[PDB]
């Protein structure tokens, strides 16, 4: 039967089923006040699916100049064309190659650039903003979004949305690599998975994806969405409570020293955005510091609500198009205050 919600992460993560149900706030606000992330499924079914395809972005914007990032080594590929990225998104035989002759795992950097999403893509902007879940929180002028209402003593988010466009990580070696390394945001955000690209050429990559989710610490109920409903899994997330950020900095300072980095005792390894917590580091965080996180698999049309100040990292399983909007909930306004 249709139900309003379910639980993942063994009861620790709310999953809302109907993105446009007018009663979602009643369930949402109890979990959000405790500092938890929230998942809302089904947003894809509300969107104009032809607007969110890799071939459309290539056809409409392909001549723009851009930089890419190599996800395996963080190297910058400078001053190429937006089509170089998009035409390799699903066809592996069209990707830019590293020195070693392998097809690269790439991310499209700062595109559309800065606050230009609305100007460059007005039909996409309208399609996203009118279908975001929890609209009193997430719309630019929602009654519970303080973004437009705060003085200069509070850090205000830039005008969004922002896109996250990157290929899937492929190999056993790639299992320890981040798409986006561990960091935090001083505003709340909602990140929507609008397209998942399962490639061809090296098409039959199904079993490394299962071992990644398993070793990623995904819960048994999450393993059922793949095997039973055949939904398309996009990306593996780890999210940590805002209250645990300093313990994570203590672990990463100690590992930095062990690996002979030479760092002032006060340096900020989360702000540096240089670390990905692999299975070894996640086990050490739990055993040595008493810190548990949320392992989340984001499928096509899942919206991930990320609390202000919560450290988070993202590992793409397949090629993903994600779009995110920042907001400032009253529950979390402390995280953007500039004093004490
Ligand atoms: Cl909080
Ligand atoms: Cl558009
Ligand atoms: Cl709402
Ligand atoms: Cl990163
Ligand atoms: Mn982030």
Curated annotation (Swiss-Prot):
**Gene (name only):** KDM3B
- Provide the coiled-coil residue spans: none
Q: Please give the tissue specificity annotation from the record for this chain.
A: Ubiquitous. Highly expressed in placenta, skeletal muscle, kidney, heart and liver.
Provide the disease association from the record: Diets-Jongmans syndrome: An autosomal dominant disorder characterized by varying degrees of intellectual disability, developmental delay, short stature, and characteristic facial features such as a wide mouth, a pointed chin, long ears and a low columella.
- Role this protein plays: Histone demethylase that specifically demethylates 'Lys-9' of histone H3, thereby playing a central role in histone code. Demethylation of Lys residue generates formaldehyde and succinate. May have tumor suppressor activity.
- Domain comment in the entry: Leu-Xaa-Xaa-Leu-Leu (LXXLL) motifs are known to mediate the association with nuclear receptors.
User: Can you say what this protein is called?
Assistant: Lysine-specific demethylase 3B
Q: What residues does Fe cation bind to?
A: 183, 185, 312
Segment forming the signal sequence: none
Q: Which family does it belong to?
A: Belongs to the JHDM2 histone demethylase family.
Q: Where is the JmjC domain?
A: 121-340
Extra remark: Its gene is located in the 5q region of the genome which is deleted in del(5q) interstitial deletion, a frequent deletion found in myeloid leukemias and myelodysplasias, suggesting that it may be a good candidate for the del(5q) tumor suppressor gene.
| Localization per record | Nucleus
